[model samples]
Target: SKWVFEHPETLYAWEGACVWIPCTYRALDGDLESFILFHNPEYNKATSKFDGTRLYESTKDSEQKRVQFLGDKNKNCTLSIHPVHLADSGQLGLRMESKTEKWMERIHLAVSERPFPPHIQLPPEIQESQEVTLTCLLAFSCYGYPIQLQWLLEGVPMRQAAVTSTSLTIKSVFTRSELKFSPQWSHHGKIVTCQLQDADGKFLSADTVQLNVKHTPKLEIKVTPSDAIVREGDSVTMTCEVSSSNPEYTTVSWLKDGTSLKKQNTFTLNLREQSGKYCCQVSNDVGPGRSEEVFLQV
Candidate 1:
């Protein structure tokens, strides 16, 4: 078989970042130890010898300072370039040659400038059991590569995220992902995060927002051993029940004669002397609700 150069058709990199290009070649019935690697601006299918820029000849040199030939030319031809410049964009001509035969491969390298940090939009306040949607918006100058988004809740990945995109201009694109879920009391004060990745699995941008959950409590109070004529030494119990609350852990307080009884939820009293008006208050993070006054007769 003729000598063949194998490499990716296209790769993307950042203007000021580093990029690694994997390359390899195969030769027929001979060792690749004598083959050399070179790069050029123009494509040439007829002649290959160091006619263009010489990138590597089994070793690196000062002229190609930013380039690192990591792969062995005898087996592989992987190359690394750091601080890639905007002028380094477009198709790159990579060639490999041995004493007898030569092969050339054309690969496109797209260099993009860094984009701004993603913007995250979230509701000011969310109530428990309410459906909420959070959006992560990002703008990019190039859309040659597809963008992927990942949603995280308290550092854990959330799989039910939806992504969408729109063209902002001829060369710019705006992408967004909406993360929807039902808010729960446990999610209050927690963080929701969004991460953006390019088609090559490179992290582009990330943003996060704090969750604010609202809670409301509705309570009803009841008094047992009510109007039943209880002896002076009999025991009476008043129970305050919470019918509903956004947060399940609503605090219940008992009050008597407009004064706090320092009792919680249920209060017990010995009918030593009497009759009293009792009430209860149920409160959560948002506010408090009071039950109607009940008379305990002895």
Candidate 2:
């Protein structure tokens, strides 16, 4: 009598996560009577036997109704795994029997959690004349896999003129790397980052550190319809605009004259009730970026 057994297979990455293990088997014609599957911690013939089209809950001893069986006795016996989680990392088994003859196969699988981005920090408020050491630290875990760290500035990976330090703590299994930079006024307000990459050429996480030059840049406001003299029952709109200067700066303020204007993408200084000169100013750090002060005469 000819007999054959097949092992299980899967397609999952440690960082990509959520793995599915497909257990299958094949036997000679008129050779197999029934097929069953088993998985770790372990399984026995009498207690572990199960029917097709039924879900088997690994966590629960009882049979689960959700899992379905996709096996063809005429061809091959197969198991379909779905919605796999990070905890389903283990060995799986498949068993097939024909009368007195039986065969079994097993496969090993691993599921992992994706690494998180590390937090980078530095001493606050570095003066122009003072020399300060800015350290970039990054930390994350990838199960048993170790990650490599690199430093980049303005999208270019930096290698020279900078010192790097690495540490893998035993207590936390935390993979970390640190880089030091001497703060100069020329390096002020520049965006720097610490990036972590795995053996698969995938970035596990990144820590972005921005050097604060001083106070945020001054924002100047400009608005359209600089001055308008309108009679009653008119819809007056002011378009407050801001100019772009640098990446670290953005506008988040809306104001009219000396008072705070309503929060909106567009300001409608309507004279429906009563109105005087209405001004809208869009302000933020960098460039004293301001819009023309709009005036409304009602």
Candidate 3:
């Protein structure tokens, strides 16, 4: 009986990943009932079979647990390896049995290391009440493979973001994502992280950055009398209170009738001649804020 073997010349596999090797054969005499696949240091096409590291067999046993046989009994010899390691790179030998023994060509397995961590592009400083966009980039050398990306804010998963992936070249696959949201003062000094994973959602790498949120003071004007109508010559006072701000280097300026009155938080009006419109202006190191005008009739 004459036999011919066919298999891939080269196969690529990533570390901590799974890989499949395609194999098939043809017999001139008849069909084969069973086959054997194993790994060896070198390939010998002249020899029909030899004792090598047994990887797959038609019969089930304790030694055939790590290898999976996906091929059929009619000449398909496809094999699969799960959780490939660095030492799995070598020559794979195959043998077919029918009326006579036939030896198949060996397969060359090339294993690659895990991808590097993703690169993060974070804004140095962002203002409160403004939309912020954080970017995460990951580049891998494997082509035709799907990649997954995720975002985390303050150690918790963030879903209010957009994720996109693209293949730049045959050897480089790029993945990027953006987190868009209106930041608040509570997010200041929080930690933001980006996670890189495979198409199966397995964690591969991650990166982190600190957030610096610059927020302006929110000013509110409060009147001590609380009465809109006051008698003439009555003493009335206005206070400029800040709801939230940087707290340091914050100054409140009082305004009367669109004119600057005093640069203080409290303004006392004796109701002698100052009684038209009163407002408060607040300013910090980052930005400025203004309050609504209050009418005081005397």
Candidate 4:
């Protein structure tokens, strides 16, 4: 069995910041001890065995001065380079050595002052066969790694288009994934979600956006309670209905005055001492909201 490298051949970055170069290489047999060798083009004047020194030691010209070895050496060697300086921008290489042999991988490190946020904008409209360009704008200056853009159309309910990215960074991490798809009529009135999650896979604040789509049908609710004098203990059910094209869900709240109803969506109240005014509010998730109040004397 042989060990194979499944990740990037080299990584690059800029200065006064941070970079995480992913290195994925695994063995075909069992677990083995391993370590990574980080090298510097300038420090390796001799280009010998000592060209790329060990990490963590304080050496002004050494890569270890700014680069922190991350990830699991036993599994993957992902390096985290921080507070990068202009001079520190260059190529970065990784090597994994076990008890028997060693495997090596490298990526060119290029760091810039490029700092900005990714732009996610939705076209004015989306209709079937209609050309829709969801532009994910980013910074003009930086290395070439297409920022991934995923389009979540109309939230968690509707099917979406394919994900893509523009080959550039807004501010290193800033990026936009432009989605070009022929819009269907169903997509005319739905939200388009764009997001960028941090390294931890958790979404970073100010990195998420929603494109509002307007087109839900409009409707009205009309509830009429028997306005005659009601005797005590007579069971009465006032219907709060939906007047739209059929709502997925209906919520009818029965309120007495401006206060919230103790019984949500129910119009059955014991006349032990019931009196004053009663109102019922009917609302559907995607329809016109309403409140209907009726006066009754008990």
Candidate 5:
């Protein structure tokens, strides 16, 4: 007689989680009869069969239908267990019997409470005002596989726009989601985190990425004693200041009456020559920024 059976030898799940197990088998027998599942069964040579308390039996003993039979008794013996308890952590065994032949198989189950944190996919540096979508992925069980996934800026949680969510199955299990939004100048250097909340609404795990957002430079021109009139050759000082930018400014160029002048950040005003409207221009990789025009009146 030729007989063959195939199925995964290991199963994983968490307490109160609904888990699906796949199985397939082929046996050279006349007719198959009962497909039954037993918990923590042991082999008994005397009866040539497995001996343990029965969890489910296709022929009888429904037991409130806790264990669902998802396959035909002929070849596929797939099963699904729902609302599982921690005490169900032992070996899981299934038995198939024919009129003249009988077969049995057993597998181990490992259950846990804490699952691995979700991974966030994003670039290290982003430009301000650019729309970005952050993807978060998670596999395994977090006391029922995470109730919801959310985003957080620095430490505060997100409020609206909703994260698109779905569970992906590549013959396995995982939850993948995406959050779409736009980055602003204020978001630069701030930490963005993706968090997983379990069924009990408790934090399971999270991952963070600091956004290196690039923005255009902001410039300002300040002249000393602007509130009073300055005489020729007087101690009239002016400053070309960079209010904010990313990675620092590359060049500081001054402008006089709409014309480019010397690249000096600090220039003094002499009422004789420096009597026109002055402006400061600072530049980075993004673009150049020009400050408001400042009129130097003596």
Candidate 6:
């Protein structure tokens, strides 16, 4: 219809962040020339309808700050309010005026203490020591001071790593950042978080992620006899150590002279049956089939 107005019934304004009130309209008469935005709780009720006394006389131009007319009244009527305060929560009424016709629209404004968390996008597969780009994005219609987004890997700020480039593009609506780093095996299953900040650099909501990095397990073996050069009735100790991936979904085994020994991490032998070469192996669901036969002489 030519005589139409459109806007969201309610809009959320995060504290210290900008909020955009989406609006578009058409009129039967000439293009509109004036606008009035005010907070009036009286315009809202339990029913899904708004009824308020029209202030057609107060549609004159008003001196303003922080609030912006995002669209010209010819066909666009969008509005933006910045650094929203808690006291700003109410029904924000809008009046559009033309020489021959006028239109009115009301939208509920709810000021929130916290902003919505950013969304995280990850690669299809994450591998150890491979450069990957993890993105944090927040999409809205807001326009105000610039917003910042940063990343944290295991609580250690990734903003310090390899330049976490951020871009707030196309009229302060999309806040996005790209974190370029090679995921370490130690970072697998650990928290990799993306967070937001206002123009003032005040911290805001965060989006946490645990990376599943594909990497082979590492193995090490230590023997006491320090040199396994000892008597026939010698006490010998063997230690098997492994740093694995993916929640310890790991299998560790020991080899003595190319033959399978017990699967214990550490064990002591009361006596030596004969001369043996020692080594260890490790495998997991993702990082599989790695054997380190250090081949120690005992």
Cα-based lDDT for every prediction: 0.64, 0.49, 0.68, 0.48, 0.71, 0.65
> Which segments of model 4 are wrong by more than 4 Å?
9-13, 28-34, 41-50, 53-66, 116-131, 137-174, 177-298
Please report the TM-score between candidate 4 and the true structure: 0.37
Per-model TM-score on C-alpha atoms: 0.42, 0.33, 0.49, 0.37, 0.67, 0.67
TM-score of 5: 0.67
Q: How many residue pairs in model 4 have overlapping backbones?
A: 27
lDDT of 1 by residue, 63-163 (tens): 34676666654656666666566667666665555667656667677766763357789887788778888888765323334567778788888877575
Better of 2 and 4 by TM-score: 4
lDDT tens per residue, model 2, 1-298: 3555443343332444323233344456465566555555344467764333213432242124323444555454444344344555465545567676666565564545655565666776664445555555443333335456667776678753445454322222233455544444445667777776766757776778776654333344432344555566555555444333333444444555556655543433333433434444433443333444545665
The candidate, 1 or 3, that scores higher on lDDT is 3
Off by over 4 Å in 5: 1-16, 20-68, 74-78, 84-111, 140-146, 168-172, 198-202, 220-222, 226-228, 241-244, 265-273
Clash totals in order? 0, 15, 0, 27, 0, 0
Ranking by lDDT: 5, 3, 6, 1, 2, 4
In candidate 1, what residue range of length 10 has the lowest lDDT sum? 265-274
Q: Worst 10-residue stretch by lDDT in candidate 3?
A: 264-273
lDDT of 2: 0.49
lDDT of 6 by residue, 1-298 (tens): 5467766666665777677666777787777767676666253567834455332222433325566666775677677677577767777777667887655567777776778788998888997888898888766436555667778777777644533343333223455677788777877888888877777868878899888888776655667777756555566666666656553545666666766665543323333445666666667666543344443343
Cα lDDT, model 2, residue 79: 44
Model 5, CA-based lDDT: 0.71
lDDT of 6 at 230: 59
Error of 4 at 26 (Å): 1.0
Tell me the lDDT of model 3 at 247.
Answer: 41
